[PDB]
Amino acid sequence: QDLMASGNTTVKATFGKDSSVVKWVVLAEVLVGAVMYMMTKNVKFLAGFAIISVFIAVGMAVVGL
Amino acid sequence: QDLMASGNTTVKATFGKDSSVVKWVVLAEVLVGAVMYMMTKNVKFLAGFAIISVFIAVGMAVVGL
Amino acid sequence: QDLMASGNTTVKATFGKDSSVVKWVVLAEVLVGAVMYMMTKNVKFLAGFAIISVFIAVGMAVVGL
Amino acid sequence: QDLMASGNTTVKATFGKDSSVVKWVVLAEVLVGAVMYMMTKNVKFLAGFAIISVFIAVGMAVVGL
Amino acid sequence: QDLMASGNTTVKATFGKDSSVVKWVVLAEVLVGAVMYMMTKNVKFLAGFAIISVFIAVGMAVVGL
Amino acid sequence: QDLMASGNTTVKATFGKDSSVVKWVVLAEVLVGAVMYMMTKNVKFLAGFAIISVFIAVGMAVVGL
Amino acid sequence: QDLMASGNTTVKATFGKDSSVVKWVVLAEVLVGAVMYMMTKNVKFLAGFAIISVFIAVGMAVVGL
Amino acid sequence: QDLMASGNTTVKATFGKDSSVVKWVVLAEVLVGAVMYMMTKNVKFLAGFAIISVFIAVGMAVVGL
Amino acid sequence: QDLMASGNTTVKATFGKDSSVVKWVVLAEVLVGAVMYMMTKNVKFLAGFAIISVFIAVGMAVVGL
Amino acid sequence: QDLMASGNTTVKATFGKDSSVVKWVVLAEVLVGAVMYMMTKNVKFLAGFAIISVFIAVGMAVVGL
Amino acid sequence: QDLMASGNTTVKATFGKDSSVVKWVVLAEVLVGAVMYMMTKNVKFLAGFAIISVFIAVGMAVVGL
Amino acid sequence: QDLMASGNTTVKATFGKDSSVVKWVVLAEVLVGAVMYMMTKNVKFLAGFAIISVFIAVGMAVVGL
Amino acid sequence: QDLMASGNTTVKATFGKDSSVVKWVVLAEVLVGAVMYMMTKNVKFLAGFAIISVFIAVGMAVVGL
Amino acid sequence: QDLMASGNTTVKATFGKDSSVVKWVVLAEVLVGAVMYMMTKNVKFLAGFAIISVFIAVGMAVVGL
Amino acid sequence: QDLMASGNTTVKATFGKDSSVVKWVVLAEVLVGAVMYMMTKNVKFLAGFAIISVFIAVGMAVVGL
Amino acid sequence: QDLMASGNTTVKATFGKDSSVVKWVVLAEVLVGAVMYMMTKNVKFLAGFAIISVFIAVGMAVVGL
Amino acid sequence: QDLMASGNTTVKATFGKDSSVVKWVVLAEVLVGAVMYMMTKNVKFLAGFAIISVFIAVGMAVVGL
Amino acid sequence: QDLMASGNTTVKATFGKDSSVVKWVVLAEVLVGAVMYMMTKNVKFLAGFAIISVFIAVGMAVVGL
Amino acid sequence: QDLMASGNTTVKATFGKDSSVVKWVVLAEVLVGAVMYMMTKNVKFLAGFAIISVFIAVGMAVVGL
Amino acid sequence: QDLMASGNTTVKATFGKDSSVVKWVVLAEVLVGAVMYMMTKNVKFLAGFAIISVFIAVGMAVVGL
């Protein structure tokens, strides 16, 4: 017998490296930086905009099925 | 099956590179600079007015769906 | 569907290039210069009176919706 | 007589070091970090992404049948 | 024989993507944000107002019968 | 059959865009700003006074039944 | 049916544009300025004395029921 | 019903244009000027002695209940 | 036949808009505010003193038999 | 029948506008101000000393049975 | 019945206008001034030494049972 | 009953007008003056050496138990 | 017949205003304050040391049989 | 009958004014001051070293059996 | 019975006036002064080096078992 | 039993009067003087170069284990 | 007859002051401190390492059979 | 009988003074310092790097079986 | 048995003295210095660029497995 | 297994010695010098223009992957 936990894993395709879910955060990332940059006017919050992106890239690349 | 996280993403069009949400901050940006410039009279707070703008541009351009 | 962040943006008209909010700072600008010019008697604080004005102009002109 | 608790242990192969079940968490791991990193923008939540991975590795390696 | 769990599913129409039940939360959403925004005056609670809406949209769209 | 969740929705009229409930927060909004402005004397807390208002406007306008 | 959130709104008359509650802050306003002006001797804290007043005026005028 | 925030407002009479509280600052005003005038020997700190006085006068006169 | 759940509803008069039970909380309200205000010295806890009062008013007014 | 929640309300006289319980807080009020004033040496904590007093006055006056 | 919150109020005599507890702060007052005066050498911290004293006097005099 | 806050007040004798604690500051006073006089060579820092001394004297004399 | 719940009430004498049981807490009170004062070094935990004592006094005095 | 809560109260002698338990905190007191003084280098944490000591003294003296 | 909190108090000898633990801070003391003196170059941080030492001395001498 | 805080105190040898750690600061000392001397060209910053050195010497000599 | 609850009490020797079970916690103690010290980098978690040890010592010494 | 809690204590060898588990933290230690040093640029976080190391050394040395 | 915490420690190779993770900070180090140097234009932030580097070197060299 | 922290490091190419990010600061460098040179007219701010450049060069050259 094979493993029955499988089937679909469209879940991947749902969460896939390019999917709906993934992109959203980046917008939030872009938003929240612009958000928090307003009050502080510190150049801080513009980071994961780079980082998160490449983070998720290798992050997803680690497994991503 | 496709990914079911999708549908609309009018959310994009709601947050889209030219949308309501985006522009607001810029005003705040323009405001808060004029705000904080008053007390300090330092030429500092006039930056992201350029930066944030082009920031969000490429920032949105990074993904923006 | 359209973006639901919209509606009014009388907020613009509230913050609009000629609106209530905008003008106030300029007075403060004019005031605070006269303010700080008193103690220093340095010709410094008479600037953004020009600058801020034209600043906000193009500043608002950048987007201002 | 042998032990009758045995048979299959495809359960292993179902939970096996590389199986369906295992990978899912990592995605969640990658997700939730990106999740919680948004609100805090603290570099914290990017850890078990390394840790959990190698954790489960030796963790599974401890027994994993 | 067919499935006898069926019949009506006016329940859908009762919970349907546009129904009574659905809308209520959004008001609460709009309310509670205005609620909690008062004490904190943090721009936080104005989110699901967007999110929940589009959330339920695709959320309902996932199945919604 | 129709949906039985309905009936009244005077609740709307109770929470309606112009109703009792709505206005209260604005006062609180006006109050709490004057409140917190006292201790800080920062021009911050005078915002949602604009924002919340127009916020609820489109916010209610999003659905508001 | 009408909205049952109503009744009294003497609360208004309690918070009304001229009421007890309103005036208090102004005194505090006048006080705290004189307060903080002592230590700094900066002409700063004499502002909302004008501002807050007219602020609350239009502020209350925005809704104030 | 009337507003129940009222009653006493002896608080006024406690803070009243001529009351205990009011006068104190003026002494401090007179003191701190003499204080800070010593170290600087600049004729500066003798101002609000006039200003604060008339300030509070119209200041209290603005509302003062 | 009429409903036999009735009779007395002195319970109302026992809980009535002006009764024993009602008033107690207000004292507690007044107390607990003074209570918690001591430790924090935050102006917070002086609210429901207004709110609860008018709250119960319309609250009782909603039905109160 | 009358309401049986009544009887005594010596509780009032126990909590009465002049009673034991009431006064205590004021001492604490006077204490804690002197307390917290020590560390900060900010003139802040001397307030409710006035406020709380008159607060409880009208506060008790609101109902106080 | 009388109020049972009473009895002793030696607590007063424990906190009384001349008691143990009261005096301590004044020493701290005298100390902390000498403390903080050292680092700043600003004539500031010698105040409540007068103020606190007379403060507590009338402060206690307000009620002090 | 008497006040139980009492007992010892060797604390006085520990902080007493002539005690250990008192004298220390004076040395610091003498030191820090010599300290800060070095860099400035301004005759300033030789003051509380007189002042603090007599300050603490009457200061302690105010109460000092 | 009399009430048979009685007899002994040495329980009182066991819990009596001066008994074993009573005193223990005070020690704990004294201990736990010294306990929690260590970590915080906040002057807080030295209170019920007064309060609890007089609390139990009138507290016991309320009935204490 | 006597109270049976008694017996030993070596517990006192275990917690007694001079016992093991008592002294420990003082060391911690001495330690934690030296601890927290390091990071701040504020002269603050050297207090209860006096205070706690005499505190516990009268504190224990209050009852201490 | 004796007190059972005792035994060892090698803890003393572990924390004893000359022990491991004690000395460490002094090094830190010496270090942190040299640390913070670098950035400020203020002669400040060379104090507890004397003070802490003699502080702990009498400090330990106060009890130190 | 002996004190178990001991063992190694190679920490000393790690921080020892001649160790790695010690010397570093001196370089920084030499550096920062040359650093800050550049901008001011004041002969000031050449001091602890002597002082710190001999400072740490006796400083370490005070205890240094 | 003797007590039959006895026999073995190798349980002691199993839990004995030096046994397997005892030591484990100390490692955990040492571990968890190093654990929690990482995230906070507060010097806190290095305590029971001393305390627990001597704690269990006298703790076991209290009875330990 | 001997104690049956024993056997293996490879757990030691698993946690042993030189084992896998031990070293990890040190890396984290080295990491987190470099981590937190970035944002603050305070020389603080480089400590337990020494301390934790020698800490665990004697710490493990205390028992470590 | 051997210790089962082992296996991989590719984690080392993942965090190894030359690995991905290590280098990143240095860039940040180089960045943040250039970052913070801009606003201050103080020559400060160019340090750990040397320090952190050699820091991590010996730091990793301390254990690094 | 290899280290999974890797992948991309386009991050380098994103931050690479010649990349977008790098150049920006230099402009700011050139700007801010011209900025701050205006007010002071001191020849100071024209430095890192050289320095930062070559700084980042070797700085990046130190590692830069």
Author numbering:
A (entry chain 2N), B (entry chain 2M), C (entry chain 2L), D (entry chain 2O), E (entry chain 1O), F (entry chain 1N), ...: 6 to 70
Task: Please share excerpts from the published article on this structure.
Conjugative pili are widespread bacterial appendages that play important roles in horizontal gene transfer, in spread of antibiotic resistance genes, and as sites of phage attachment. The pilus is a polymer of the VirB2 protein (or pilin). The structures of the pED208 and F pilus are very similar, with overall dimensions of 87 Å in diameter and an internal lumen of 28 Å in diameter. Thus, selective binding of PG to pilins occurs in both F and pED208 pili, and thus, the F family of pili are polymers of a selective and stoichiometric protein-PG complex unit.
